Structure 1
Amino acid sequence: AITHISPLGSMDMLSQLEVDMLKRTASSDLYQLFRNCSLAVLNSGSLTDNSKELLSRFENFDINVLRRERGVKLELINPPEEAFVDGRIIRALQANLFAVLRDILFVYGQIHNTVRFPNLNLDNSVHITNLVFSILRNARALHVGEAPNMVVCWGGHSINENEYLYARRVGNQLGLRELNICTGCGPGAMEAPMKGAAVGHAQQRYKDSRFIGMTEPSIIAAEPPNPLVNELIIMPDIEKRLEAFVRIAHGIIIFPGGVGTAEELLYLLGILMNPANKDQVLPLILTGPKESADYFRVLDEFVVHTLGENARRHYRIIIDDAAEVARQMKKSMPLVKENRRDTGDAYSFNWSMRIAPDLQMPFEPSHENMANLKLYPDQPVEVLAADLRRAFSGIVAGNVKEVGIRAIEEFGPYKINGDKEIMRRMDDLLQGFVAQHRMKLPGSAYIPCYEICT
């Protein structure tokens, strides 16, 4: 079974040298990744328990890039049947298919292994930001003149029915207020709010739904985007994905997501508490069903007792009140618009927010690096927030990730230079997630895997 797909929504106006480039990249060591992402996209919304095994059902699927005088076509070999309706590919899959071609072959292929974009220095913090903007602009995701209304939703890939219901309700309440949704693109909390918002949009006869799925190559290669997504963007790596979330967001909503939730909040506080960002407007709301109350309590307790009472100027917790979450998002859009007008910033992309270069770069949780963290109350709060994220991420990896356990077994616990008040707060928070089964440790009791010294 072989079918030729023409472009839709992207990759529809290429030069002959660009197509030449695309064909070369498709024949590179990148093919496997390109093929797995394109397979992921074609399996979107195919109901399945385990998605890793679903893709392992189409091992005879392949994809070639076809050259034509006018540009590019896609050749699908043994594609999933469910992606076709009386022989024609379903339009939504077709557009996501060409977003994968765009972001994996055209962008990622000129970045991975060697940077071929002329004069791009990926070690340069301004270049990075301009790249993230170029990717989003290339994806046609930044509209000229559009008044702000994009709400980014973060939260667990794997969540229970209560949480999925509540998140769906928030999205429905955002939908009834004509707000748009951007998420990480996968299942769980990344899907429920879009599903809700789609119902809301229909009720308000709102015809410009933007459901933005912002992912990255390692993830989309194994996880089909959820079926609500109608604007797929694959950023080159997780640091750039996070910067993209921040810069397109007009508001951020965090649902529960395990330990990662606290890492996300610390990243945001590290940005939002930088004195350079004291005049930015970016509403941040943490919200769950009534059963997540103690989950957000320990989190909020850890933030205040390490970063201070001022931390609460920047985030607000709301338990089981979907309508009030959306109501507050909706009310803040006009303030975000004024804030953008105030600095002459763009409505669709927040240029003026300062994201420190360390927040753009990866962090290796080695014993050396773990050691260099200055976890002391006398540090600038935005630096301490940042270092706290690094340390929390390292302690948890040392418990749950095999590359982290490997480091601990080989070299013993991490040596942490920190105030023991701060480090106690951390053990409370870690203990909290273990007790609440939000953190599931291999084996039994919670392992410190760290020690407070030099």
Structure 2
Amino acid sequence: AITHISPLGSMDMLSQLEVDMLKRTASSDLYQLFRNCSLAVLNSGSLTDNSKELLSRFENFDINVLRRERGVKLELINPPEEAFVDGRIIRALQANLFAVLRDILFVYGQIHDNSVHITNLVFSILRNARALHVGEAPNMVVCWGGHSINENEYLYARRVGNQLGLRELNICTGCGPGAMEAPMKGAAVGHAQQRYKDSRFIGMTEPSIIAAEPPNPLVNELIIMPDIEKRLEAFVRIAHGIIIFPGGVGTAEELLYLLGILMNPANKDQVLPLILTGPKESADYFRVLDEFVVHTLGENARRHYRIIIDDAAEVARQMKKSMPLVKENRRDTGDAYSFNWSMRIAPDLQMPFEPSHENMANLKLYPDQPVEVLAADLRRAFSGIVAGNVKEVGIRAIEEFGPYKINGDKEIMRRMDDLLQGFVAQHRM
């Protein structure tokens, strides 16, 4: 059993009682969650997609938290060698590990209306991560995209980040590979071209997806949200602008969850730019997704977004010119620049979902509905098959007792399976 001991980057101190919460036992669940999250960080740049196999490869790996003279040390037992560069752990992965130690301890010490308490946990987690700060102008634009993406979609996703970084704007993704790291490498060379001295590449993951989508090495501010819904909520609240790239089913869910918030009449005065961008060959891909949400949510969905094709400079130029309007709107409310408190996320979009055939059953998918409740629970169906696609329980539940094809309707069921078939075509998992 070969070990390695990692130092803190910023002075970090624990008590003998906080470390004991992480002490290795077979009865305390909390170590396991801390152990696997640490393992996922160490498999950054994973050459695979499956999440069941990565744990089965590093089983003798473990982690001990230590209290030394200068603070906390992470004693890593049998760490993956691909995390090292010449016998030393890549310092981004070191910072990610201590971010995992920071968030896990916080989200569990705080546990020990109801919608106000949830958004505040999101606010308190980002604040404790020191991830809530604005410069002279808000510049945080989050980017959504798939994991297994094209070679041209990657280059296009790098060109957009470079033109975004050239205009001094920061990126926030779900810290995954593919379209979730390509804009960061572009922005890394973009900030270098304009001498932007303080880049913030925020990766926001959560335990149940971190093993399938390992945090890419370009992330410099990683935050662990408790579950899927709070990570989605953190996205739109820390955001000043959104750009969406072609992606698998996980990207579809993100688009609806958000679209279920701008279409709420309680958010008619909120400003939030959204551009769906893609390379030359994503023209057909985008038309089939527009024809989706224009058949699901009506033609109202096109008043809140614009689609641009084969252009990196325009979507960055238009995203930059939106920050003054974003800034101005935060002041009229009296809101904050670094956190959108005023936007109303309905309690039906904050509620969690554990994917089962049983619960995938009674999904309300009729176009009858208020635009909100349809997309609110339609995105649950996408959350269900990402679990069936990537994560241990959804894969297993879909393995043993069958697949999910549960609720039909007019075009939308024509369109639902139009998409996943139009998704498997380009191998989007």
The TM-score with structure 2 as length reference comes to: 0.85
Is 272-281 or 95-104 further displaced after alignment? 95-104
Distance 1:129 1:146, change over 3 A: farther
Matches for 1:31-430 after TM superposition, within 5 Å: 31-44=31-44, 59-68=59-68, 71-80=71-80, 89-108=89-108, 124-143=114-133, 147-221=137-211, 223-364=213-354, 372-391=362-381, 420-426=410-416, 428-429=418-419
Distance 1:60 1:14, change over 3 A: closer
Indicate the SS of the match to 2:421. Answer: helix
Is 134-143 or 300-309 further displaced after alignment? 300-309
- The offset of 1:176, in angstroms, is 0.8
Distance 1:109 1:206, change over 3 A: same
Identity across the alignment (%): 100
Q: Relative CO higher for 1 or 2, CA cutoff 8 Å, sep ≥ 6?
A: 2
- The offset of 1:350, in angstroms, is 0.8
Distance 1:103 1:203, change over 3 A: same
1:11-30 CA deviation, whole Å, 9 max, x = no partner?
A: 71445554454558998333
The answer on whether the counterparts of 2:171 and 2:202 sit within 8 Å (CA) in structure 1 is: yes
The answer on whether the counterparts of 2:51 and 2:392 sit within 8 Å (CA) in structure 1 is: no
Bigger radius of gyration among the two:
1
- The offset of 1:428, in angstroms, is 4.6
Is 216-225 or 387-396 further displaced after alignment? 387-396
CA distance in structure 2 between the aligned counterparts of 1:246 and 1:137, rounded to whole angstroms = 15
The answer on whether the counterparts of 1:5 and 1:94 sit within 8 Å (CA) in structure 2 is: no
The answer on whether the counterparts of 1:239 and 1:359 sit within 8 Å (CA) in structure 2 is: yes
Is 415-424 or 252-261 further displaced after alignment? 415-424
RMSD of equivalent CA atoms = 3.8
CA distance in structure 1 between the aligned counterparts of 2:267 and 2:214, rounded to whole angstroms = 36
- The offset of 1:384, in angstroms, is 2.6
The TM-score with structure 1 as length reference comes to: 0.81
The answer on whether the counterparts of 2:398 and 2:404 sit within 8 Å (CA) in structure 1 is: yes
Is 189-198 or 254-263 further displaced after alignment? 254-263
Indicate the SS of the match to 1:427. Answer: helix
1:146-174 CA deviation, whole Å, 9 max, x = no partner?
A: 53111111111111211111111111111
- The offset of 1:334, in angstroms, is 1.2
- The offset of 1:186, in angstroms, is 1.7
Distance 1:341 1:415, change over 3 A: same
1:39-62 CA deviation, whole Å, 9 max, x = no partner?
A: 333443588898987776655443
Distance 1:358 1:25, change over 3 A: farther
The answer on whether the counterparts of 2:204 and 2:223 sit within 8 Å (CA) in structure 1 is: yes
1:298-328 CA deviation, whole Å, 9 max, x = no partner?
A: 1101211232222101111111111111111
Indicate the SS of the match to 1:368. Answer: coil
1:395-444 CA deviation, whole Å, 9 max, x = no partner?
A: 898899997799899999989787635544445555544666657xxxxx
CA distance in structure 1 between the aligned counterparts of 2:322 and 2:28, rounded to whole angstroms = 47
Is 297-306 or 75-84 further displaced after alignment? 75-84
Is 256-265 or 389-398 further displaced after alignment? 389-398
The answer on whether the counterparts of 1:19 and 1:72 sit within 8 Å (CA) in structure 2 is: no
- The offset of 1:138, in angstroms, is 0.9
The answer on whether the counterparts of 2:49 and 2:212 sit within 8 Å (CA) in structure 1 is: no
CA distance in structure 2 between the aligned counterparts of 1:426 and 1:438, rounded to whole angstroms = 15
The answer on whether the counterparts of 2:7 and 2:73 sit within 8 Å (CA) in structure 1 is: yes
Is 21-30 or 266-275 further displaced after alignment? 21-30
Gaps of 5+ in 2: none
CA distance in structure 1 between the aligned counterparts of 2:172 and 2:304, rounded to whole angstroms = 21
Is 317-326 or 428-437 further displaced after alignment? 428-437
Gaps of 5+ in 1: 113-122, 440-454
